[PDB]
Amino acid sequence: SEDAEQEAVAALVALGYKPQEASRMVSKIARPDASSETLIRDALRAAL
Amino acid sequence: DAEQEAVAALVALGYKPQEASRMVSKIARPDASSETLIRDALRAALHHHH
Amino acid sequence: TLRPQYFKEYIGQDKVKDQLKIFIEAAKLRDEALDHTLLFGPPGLGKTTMAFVIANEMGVNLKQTSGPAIEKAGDLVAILNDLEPGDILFIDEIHRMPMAVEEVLYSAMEDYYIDIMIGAGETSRSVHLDLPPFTLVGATTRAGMLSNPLRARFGINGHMEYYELPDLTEIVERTSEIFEMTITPEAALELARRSRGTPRIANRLLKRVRDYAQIMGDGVIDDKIADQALTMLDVDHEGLDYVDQKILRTMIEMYGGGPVGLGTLSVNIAEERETVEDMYEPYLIQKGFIMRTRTGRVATAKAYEHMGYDYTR
Amino acid sequence: TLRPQYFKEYIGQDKVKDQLKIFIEAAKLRDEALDHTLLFGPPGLGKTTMAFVIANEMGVNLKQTSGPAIEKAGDLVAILNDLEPGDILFIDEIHRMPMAVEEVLYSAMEDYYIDIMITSRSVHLDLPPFTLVGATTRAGMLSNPLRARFGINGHMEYYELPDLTEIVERTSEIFEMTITPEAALELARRSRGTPRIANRLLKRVRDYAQIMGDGVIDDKIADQALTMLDVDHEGLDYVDQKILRTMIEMYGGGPVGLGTLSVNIAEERETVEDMYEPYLIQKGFIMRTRTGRVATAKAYEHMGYDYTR
Amino acid sequence: TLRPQYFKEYIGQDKVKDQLKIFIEAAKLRDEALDHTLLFGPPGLGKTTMAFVIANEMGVNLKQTSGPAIEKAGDLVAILNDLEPGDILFIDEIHRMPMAVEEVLYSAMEDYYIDIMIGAGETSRSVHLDLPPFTLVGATTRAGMLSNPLRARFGINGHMEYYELPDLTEIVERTSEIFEMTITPEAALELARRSRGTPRIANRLLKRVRDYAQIMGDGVIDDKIADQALTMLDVDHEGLDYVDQKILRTMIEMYGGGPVGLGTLSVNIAEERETVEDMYEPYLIQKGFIMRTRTGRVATAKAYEHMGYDYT
Amino acid sequence: TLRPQYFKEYIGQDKVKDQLKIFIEAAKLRDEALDHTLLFGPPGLGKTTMAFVIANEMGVNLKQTSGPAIEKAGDLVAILNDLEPGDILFIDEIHRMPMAVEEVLYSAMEDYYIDIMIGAGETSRSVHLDLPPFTLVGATTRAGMLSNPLRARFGINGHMEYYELPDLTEIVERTSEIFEMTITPEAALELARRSRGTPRIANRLLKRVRDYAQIMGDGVIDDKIADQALTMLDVDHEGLDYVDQKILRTMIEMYGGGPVGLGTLSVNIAEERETVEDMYEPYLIQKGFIMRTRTGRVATAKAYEHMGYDYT
Amino acid sequence: TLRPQYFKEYIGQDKVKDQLKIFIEAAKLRDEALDHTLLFGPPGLGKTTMAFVIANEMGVNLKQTSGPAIEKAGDLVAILNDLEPGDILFIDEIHRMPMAVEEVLYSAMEDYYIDIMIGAGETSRSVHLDLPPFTLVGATTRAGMLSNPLRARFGINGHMEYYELPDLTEIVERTSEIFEMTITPEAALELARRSRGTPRIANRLLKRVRDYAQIMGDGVIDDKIADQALTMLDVDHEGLDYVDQKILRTMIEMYGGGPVGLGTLSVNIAEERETVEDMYEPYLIQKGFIMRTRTGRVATAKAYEHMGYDYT
Amino acid sequence: TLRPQYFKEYIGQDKVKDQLKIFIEAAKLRDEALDHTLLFGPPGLGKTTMAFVIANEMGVNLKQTSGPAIEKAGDLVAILNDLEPGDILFIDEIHRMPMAVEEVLYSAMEDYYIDIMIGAGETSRSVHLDLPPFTLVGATTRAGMLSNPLRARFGINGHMEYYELPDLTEIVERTSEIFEMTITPEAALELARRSRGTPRIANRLLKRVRDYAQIMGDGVIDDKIADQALTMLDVDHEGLDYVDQKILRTMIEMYGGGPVGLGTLSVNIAEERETVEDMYEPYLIQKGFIMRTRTGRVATAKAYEHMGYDYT
DNA sequence: CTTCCTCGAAGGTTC
DNA sequence: GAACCTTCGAGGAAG
Ligand SMILES: Nc1ncnc2c1ncn2[C@@H]1O[C@H](COP(=O)(O)OP(=O)(O)O)[C@@H](O)[C@H]1O
Ligand SMILES: [Mg+2]
Ligand SMILES: [Mg+2]
Ligand SMILES: [Mg+2]
Numbered sequence A: 001s002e003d004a005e006q007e008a009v010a011a012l013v014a015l016g017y018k019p020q021e022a023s024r025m026v027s028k029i030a031r032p033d034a035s036s037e038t039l040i041r042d043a044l045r046a047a048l
Numbered sequence B: 001d002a003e004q005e006a007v008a009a010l011v012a013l014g015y016k017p018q019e020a021s022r023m024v025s026k027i028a029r030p031d032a033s034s035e036t037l038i039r040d041a042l043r044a045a046l047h048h049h050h
Numbered sequence C: 001t002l003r004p005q006y007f008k009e010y011i012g013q014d015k016v017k018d019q020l021k022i023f024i025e026a027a028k029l030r031d032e033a034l035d036h037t038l039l040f041g042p043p044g045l046g047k048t049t050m051a052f053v054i055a056n057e058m059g060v061n062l063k064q065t066s067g068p069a070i071e072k073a074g075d076l077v078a079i080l081n082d083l084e085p086g087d088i089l090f091i092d093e094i095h096r097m098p099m100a101v102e103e104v105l106y107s108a109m110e111d112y113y114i115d116i117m118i119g120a121g122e123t124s125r126s127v128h129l130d131l132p133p134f135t136l137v138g139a140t141t142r143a144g145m146l147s148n149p150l151r152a153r154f155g156i157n158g159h160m161e162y163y164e165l166p167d168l169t170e171i172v173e174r175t176s177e178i179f180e181m182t183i184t185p186e187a188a189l190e191l192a193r194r195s196r197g198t199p200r201i202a203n204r205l206l207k208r209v210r211d212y213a214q215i216m217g218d219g220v221i222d223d224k225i226a227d228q229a230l231t232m233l234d235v236d237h238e239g240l241d242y243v244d245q246k247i248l249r250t251m252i253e254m255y256g257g258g259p260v261g262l263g264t265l266s267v268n269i270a271e272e273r274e275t276v277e278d279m280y281e282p283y284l285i286q287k288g289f290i291m292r293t294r295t296g297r298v299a300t301a302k303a304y305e306h307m308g309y310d311y312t313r
Numbered sequence D: 001t002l003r004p005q006y007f008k009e010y011i012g013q014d015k016v017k018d019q020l021k022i023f024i025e026a027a028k029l030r031d032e033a034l035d036h037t038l039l040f041g042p043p044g045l046g047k048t049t050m051a052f053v054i055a056n057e058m059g060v061n062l063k064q065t066s067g068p069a070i071e072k073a074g075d076l077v078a079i080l081n082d083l084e085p086g087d088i089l090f091i092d093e094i095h096r097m098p099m100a101v102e103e104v105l106y107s108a109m110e111d112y113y114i115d116i117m118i119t120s121r122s123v124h125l126d127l128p129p130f131t132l133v134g135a136t137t138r139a140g141m142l143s144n145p146l147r148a149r150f151g152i153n154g155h156m157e158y159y160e161l162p163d164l165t166e167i168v169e170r171t172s173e174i175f176e177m178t179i180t181p182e183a184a185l186e187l188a189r190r191s192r193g194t195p196r197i198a199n200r201l202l203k204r205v206r207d208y209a210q211i212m213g214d215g216v217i218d219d220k221i222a223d224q225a226l227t228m229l230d231v232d233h234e235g236l237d238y239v240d241q242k243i244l245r246t247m248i249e250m251y252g253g254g255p256v257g258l259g260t261l262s263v264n265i266a267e268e269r270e271t272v273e274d275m276y277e278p279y280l281i282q283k284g285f286i287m288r289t290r291t292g293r294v295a296t297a298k299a300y301e302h303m304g305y306d307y308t309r
Numbered sequence E, F, G, H: 001t002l003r004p005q006y007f008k009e010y011i012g013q014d015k016v017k018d019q020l021k022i023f024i025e026a027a028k029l030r031d032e033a034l035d036h037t038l039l040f041g042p043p044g045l046g047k048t049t050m051a052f053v054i055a056n057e058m059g060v061n062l063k064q065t066s067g068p069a070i071e072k073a074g075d076l077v078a079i080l081n082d083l084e085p086g087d088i089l090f091i092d093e094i095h096r097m098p099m100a101v102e103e104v105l106y107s108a109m110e111d112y113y114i115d116i117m118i119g120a121g122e123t124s125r126s127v128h129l130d131l132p133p134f135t136l137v138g139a140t141t142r143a144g145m146l147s148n149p150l151r152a153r154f155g156i157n158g159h160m161e162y163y164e165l166p167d168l169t170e171i172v173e174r175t176s177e178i179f180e181m182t183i184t185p186e187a188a189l190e191l192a193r194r195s196r197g198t199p200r201i202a203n204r205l206l207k208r209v210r211d212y213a214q215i216m217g218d219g220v221i222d223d224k225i226a227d228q229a230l231t232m233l234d235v236d237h238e239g240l241d242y243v244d245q246k247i248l249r250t251m252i253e254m255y256g257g258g259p260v261g262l263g264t265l266s267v268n269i270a271e272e273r274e275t276v277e278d279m280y281e282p283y284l285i286q287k288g289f290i291m292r293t294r295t296g297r298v299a300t301a302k303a304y305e306h307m308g309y310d311y312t
Numbered sequence I: 001c002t003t004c005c006t007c008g009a010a011g012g013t014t015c
Numbered sequence J: 001g002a003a004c005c006t007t008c009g010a011g012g013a014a015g
Helices: A002-014 A019-027 A036-046 B002-012 B017-026 B034-041 C014-028 C047-058 C073-082 C099-110 C165-175 C185-192 C199-213 C223-232 C242-254 C262-269 C273-286 C301-307 D014-030 D047-058 D073-080 D099-111 D161-174 D181-189 D195-211 D219-229 D238-250 D258-265 D269-282 D297-303 E014-029 E047-058 E073-081 E099-111 E165-178 E185-194 E199-215 E223-232 E242-255 E262-268 E273-286 E301-307 F014-029 F047-058 F073-079 F099-111 F165-178 F185-192 F199-215 F223-232 F242-253 F262-269 F273-286 F301-307 G014-029 G047-058 G073-080 G099-111 G165-178 G185-193 G199-215 G223-232 G242-254 G262-269 G273-286 G301-307 H014-030 H047-058 H073-081 H165-179 H185-192 H199-215 H223-232 H242-255 H262-269 H273-286 H301-307
Strands: C037-040 C062-066 C088-092 C113-118 C125-130 C135-140 C156-159 C290-293 C296-299 D037-040 D062-066 D088-092 D113-117 D122-126 D131-136 D152-155 D286-289 D292-295 E037-040 E062-066 E088-092 E113-118 E125-130 E135-140 E156-159 E290-293 E296-299 F037-040 F062-066 F088-092 F113-118 F125-130 F135-140 F156-159 F290-293 F296-299 G037-040 G062-066 G088-092 G113-118 G125-130 G135-140 G156-159 G290-293 G296-299 H037-040 H062-066 H088-092 H113-118 H125-130 H135-140 H156-159 H290-293 H296-299
Touching (some): A002 A019, A002 A036, A002 C125, A019 A036, A036 C073, B002 B017, B002 B034, B002 E125, B017 B034, B034 E125, C014 C156, C014 E223, C037 C047, C047 C062, C047 C088, C047 C135, C099 C113, C185 C199, C199 C223, C242 C296, C242 C301, C262 C273, C290 E262, D014 D047, D037 D047, D047 D088, D047 D131, D062 F113, D073 D099, D073 F125, D099 D113, D161 D181, D161 D195, D181 D195, D195 D219, D195 F014, D238 D258, D238 D297, E014 E156, E014 G199, E037 E047, E047 E088, E047 E135, E099 E113, E165 E185, E165 E199, E185 E199, E185 E223, E242 E262, E242 E273, E242 E296, E242 E301, E262 E273, E262 E296, E273 E290, E290 G262, F014 F047, F014 F156, F037 F047, F047 F062, F047 F088, F047 F135, F062 H113, F073 F099, F073 H125, F099 F113, F165 F199, F185 F199, F199 F223, F199 H014, F242 F301, F262 F273, F273 F290, G014 G156, G047 G062, G047 G088, G073 G099, G099 G113, G125 H073, G165 G185, G185 G223, G199 G223, G242 G262, G242 G273, G242 G296, G242 G301, G262 G273, G262 G296, H014 H047, H014 H156, H037 H047, H047 H062, H047 H088, H073 H113, H165 H185, H185 H199, H185 H223, H199 H223, H242 H262, H242 H290, H242 H296, H242 H301, H262 H273
Parallel strands (some): C037 C156, C062 C088, C088 C135, D037 D131, D037 D152, D062 D088, D088 D131, E037 E135, E037 E156, E062 E088, F037 F135, F037 F156, F062 F088, F088 F135, G037 G135, G037 G156, G062 G088, G088 G135, H037 H135, H088 H135
Antiparallel strands (some): C113 C125, C290 C296, D113 D122, D286 D292, F113 F125, G113 G125, H113 H125
């Protein structure tokens, strides 16, 4: 899952979020097994 | 000696000291010249796309 | 009605209203979203209200935001995920969006997907996010500063116009039903003619006439009271304030129509340069009473026949 | 005190004073807040004074701040959070607020709610009914969207000799000076139509009456006191009288340019145009022309010369 | 995509199209890169589309960027290093990039190498870096806005121009096929006459006439229907838009043809002066509807008769 | 010392000096602060000197600063809040203060309070600061550069005029006792009449003649020494410099008195158009040697009888 | 390479070369730098090339920049600190360098010292620098647009004229010899006559005709091929450019030959005033197509007999 | 060196030297600093040179800066904080200082103190800085730009005149000795008559003739080598350039001596309107070749004999 | 975003 | 009607 976490967190940073806040945002998500697409979708949806 | 030159060249091109350090520090080759280092630090940092 | 739900309930704007009716009906005849629409016009005419009516006619939900409230790409991308299939996104003041976000909107508009490039060199990759079809509705008061690539994405253009006496009168009549006061049709016309064609200005005069009609009268706004109310206030039968009349009289009586400079005119009426040039002068130009020349302002023949002075070439 | 407290004490401004009485009485009858008011016009006419009268006539507690002091959105939000129902917020020199703040204020004036991102965070607040009062000398400097939200406009005008004469009599009793009816009119004529200038002359005359007199103002003391200050019976100062004299005796009435006239009186070009000429043009002693400026027949009669076209 | 991919498919621009063929094939005979090319002309004529055709005819991988996308020398230097021999680099709005970047570009185009000077005072050095052979293709809206010393570096100048009715009628019919639109050869000419020479406009009008034909008609675009639809879109028979008609009507009715100053005109019609002089005046001047004088704008006789007003 | 300290030692300015005597004495009988005074007029006439005299006569301490030093509201809010009851604040060159700062003085001068935002973030609040009674004094050469709401608040206005031959003669004798030199009364008048009515110019001529009298003479100034020194400086009996004479001569010997334009005359003397109009022309007109007309400059009869020609 | 290396390779400009030979040779007996030299004249005549020849004759390094590229006074100081003794600094378009920068050259050229502020805040201090001996070579189009203080410091001035047919003909023959090509003497003369008297244009055209003759022809250039190839381009039968045609074709139709001010003409043809007056007007005047008048420019009879109009 | 260092070596300017000698000698006897002095006059006459001579005669260190180097009040305060008792501060091109900084000198030049703001911002107060005795030396090419309150504070004014042939001849001889070139007195007078009375121009011509006299002369500037060299530079025997000669010829050949207007003549010579009036006309009028009149300008008899035509 | 200053037009006199 | 001189007004660019 570290591959998706690093990829999804990195893509979230590419959207302009700070590395610290971006790491927390995805770290705040529960499901680890879901792919990067789900993490970014759930992360931004929850952060709305 | 090429480290100070490569870093100074990248600074002259407008890279900040933080990134210029990381860029040159990420590459390592004792036989590389300051020319081939500059041609590597940038080629290693540009996002190639298709 | 003041709060409308369909194009049947929207007062005025008959030209733009007639076009959109044909486009919406055609889009409904296919499983397609309406093309991206751009609305142009001066401020205060109703661009926000029209965007809502477009959504109800489409039978779709409406999302609202603004250019200034968007500061990073993540802000816009997060909003797009909230759009259901066919949803409408309304962006006000779209001309102020920073280029860092503008470059991201092109693919969403053109292809309905976003690419998020990540990595560098040998690690270069990109993630792909599918988006449901949506209609972007933009509104801007300034078009000359939109980039050509953004302009080419919008396919439907609409131009707003100032309201006309036969319909601005209905806005007054309707507003008089929100308050609980009777107003005669002849009195309503005399207020509409002085409202400069803007609904916001017509509401202000109605409130002021209301206050007079219930302290100096029987609580009814008839033609007899409207004349007295409009006599206390300076507003003439053309909408000109007291200071507006003083400017025209000064130019005609003391300078023979000009040319006269901004500084020389200001010291005669006792006002600042910026006050005459930005408060009073803009309406006098639109009405056609003055012109600006390399040598100063000059009064036109239309002004002479309105103030009631004899004119000579 | 020098500042009147109620409309029953505010002399003049019959146009603005009459209009506000109708709007204040109607608002009370409906128990609603007064609409937003903008006061503008020349200096010294009564803009700041009227702002306090409106609060007393409404019977409300006045909150007070200024434009220059508010420098960031965080400042305005803090002030707005302190308002209670019916409170009045008065902002003097409103033309100085930053553009980043005007956009926040014209939203609050429309919908009575704020939602702004002030380490950044969003804050949302709801506001009770309140009235904003603004005063400015440079109304044309306010953004066009903000001017559209004000529902009442008050433009101030100069005063007449009967209004200023009564003001001088009122002020004289606060200083506990004795003044005659015909001596007051001699100060009103010279006050250029402005209350602040009429109050200034009374203070300068009182100083002379106490040292060079018995501490009482009369038709004889005023003659001497006004000769020392060198103020003509039309309010012309020493430099004002010198300008008209030079024009009539060296250029035959003009036309003459601003530069030539300035060098001949030993004054700076910007002092004549910005400090002395504005009153001479409004009274009709001088006219501006495409080729220069000329003295009118009114100046010849006042200075005592035989007019020749 | 709608755009063509080879010269044998690109409609119009016969002059530009014929010149490039000779230079492209001649360069192949010599087995060397093509000279730097500058494309200029009004917006929407096909400048970007041509850039892709050149790369396909040469048989090279196209690389793209734009003037605003380059912010520091490292950006340009990086892109130039990622090139392969013979690559074609296309740069939109080559006149918009910052002046500090141009200093580096001048060396590359002329010498094919860059030499980064480093050190100060007692220290002073420079690193000499070779670049592969390449070709720069630039596109701008005005030729005179570009920095004069840069213009001398471009060997080939290609001036684009408005299409004629035969070309526009073919483009309109071609597009109608993609959309599966039934259009008669006469109606296609009606839209071409009113598209005022720009393919981008002709395509946009067609998309709007389709909707009208599907409701106010039987899905068949006849000349009789196309003419009614264009009056609904408020497009004149000469192609003057709503804004263009508003300008001429105001000059004739409120100022008797002028002269009138730009400030007065731009305040009467609620439009920004920056827009009037940039987006609308150029077509009215080229088509001879308006003339500019030191006293202001003036309406010509042609305009007086077109709008339908008796000339003085 | 070189600056007077009491109205006894302040020669001239009868109008301004007489008014300030009454206002100061009346303020003392009521035991209250003096009203706000604005001093303005030409350079070198005694503005800064009078500011220190008023402070001594009132018997209070003087706080001094200048317009160019005050750059932001934080500075003014720091100078204020350090005042004690009855202090005098003197700001020189008050016309330089930014207008964004002048608007802070409106409340302080009229009502002795200011509105201060205190704290930061959620702690930001507005509170009144209350000032003790005080007198603001300002000196400026460009009174017309101040804002109308500010000039309206100054309660006393003092305009400085030029001196005359009796007053300047006494000033020269007084200064001749600060230095240790004997000066004959006849010589003192000869220097006064050449000092254009300005005390600063009279002191400068005395210093220059002192040097000559102690190097080329016996250390005493007499009609013989004074006339020799004034010949080296080349200043005539009317105060005309070397170039002033060259201008008048050229007008009378080449143009017969004029009319002549400024440009045509500048080239004949090898001066430049801005030096002649700003340095030399002002005193020639103020003293009646030249007259300005729509057609050009003209020399008056008074100039002919000075250069010795015939007024034909 | 194409660019000449020594005076024996530089063709034409005999008047300038003859003078520079003497001064350069004299500057070699004594061990000193060459005086600051100013070159001026129309664009494209070969003045940047001359700078390289002087540097190679002196045996020193040449650094290059341009006026518009220098943004602030700190930029020029950084350059001057990086010059070796005897180096040559070439500054193009020196008349457009900002005033804040030009002010620094006055001291540097006359005395080889510069005064500048170093450090910040409490560390700020003034240092006096020493500049090693160096030569400044300036280039400008407008000999009279430089300020009076700058023009007085240049010790040598050179005016560069248009080339004659014998000179241009040989330049075409030389350029067609660097490239592998064969051109007949009659073709060289025709191509030179068509080249606006400017070397840059002659090279650009020859480089293009090389392609046509290699594809559409026999691989050799002859008058028959030159006349055809020059007709596929826009070059007129007497060298007028397509922009030149718009100018003449506008004045004769929109203004009846004139007179017309070049300001209003430029905005009606959609060309920048500066480009048309610097590049195109000088040639049209020196060849009799346009004549000057106080009211503006007027089209001569020579234009009517060229464009095919009636000289009514 | 080229610049003289003592009043014995400084040729000419006797009126300025005579005054400065008396004032410097008197200042030393009292053991006090010299009064502030202002040097002004046309370019190249020796102002900057005199400023250094004064420092050598007083026998003190000279501090140096320039008008365009000072950007903000912080710089000026820092410079003044480094002063030592009796130091001389030279500010060249003083007219370039910004007004807000020039007004800081008003106190420093006569009260020797400055008002500064200090502290972190929580606590901040005004304080008087106190300066040691110093002498400010200013030099400017145009004094009309200095504000009236500043010019009044300078105690000694020096106005530079042009040089005469006797004095200018000695400058050429002195310079020939430094170059170690022999020059005949007959030739030294031939260069002086062409130098327009300016030392800078006489040095420039002598350097150019020195080169020619040794590359193809025989190492001696004889009466004939000078004529051959000066003919190559195209300098007439009155110092007229080709442009100056063209003007006089045109007026005589095409207008019979005039009167002719400025706009009419400019067109007949293809010269820019302001160039003729600012660059060329001033010297022609001063020497008497041209005369301005109410109906135009006329060429005098002097201009006839210089060209060889028959005056009538 | 603001103060300054310079480019430009036109009224009036004289031969 | 060509040439000079003065005065006003709106830009624009360097802070
Ligand atoms: N006399 C000459 N002989 C050979 N080639 C020349 C000559 N003069 C100019 N050229 C060529 O023409 C071009 C001139 O460009 P350049 O010297 O930069 O002109 P500019 O300096 O006016 O821009 C160069 O390509 C140069 O090689
Ligand atoms: Mg107030
Ligand atoms: Mg002072
Ligand atoms: Mg110097």
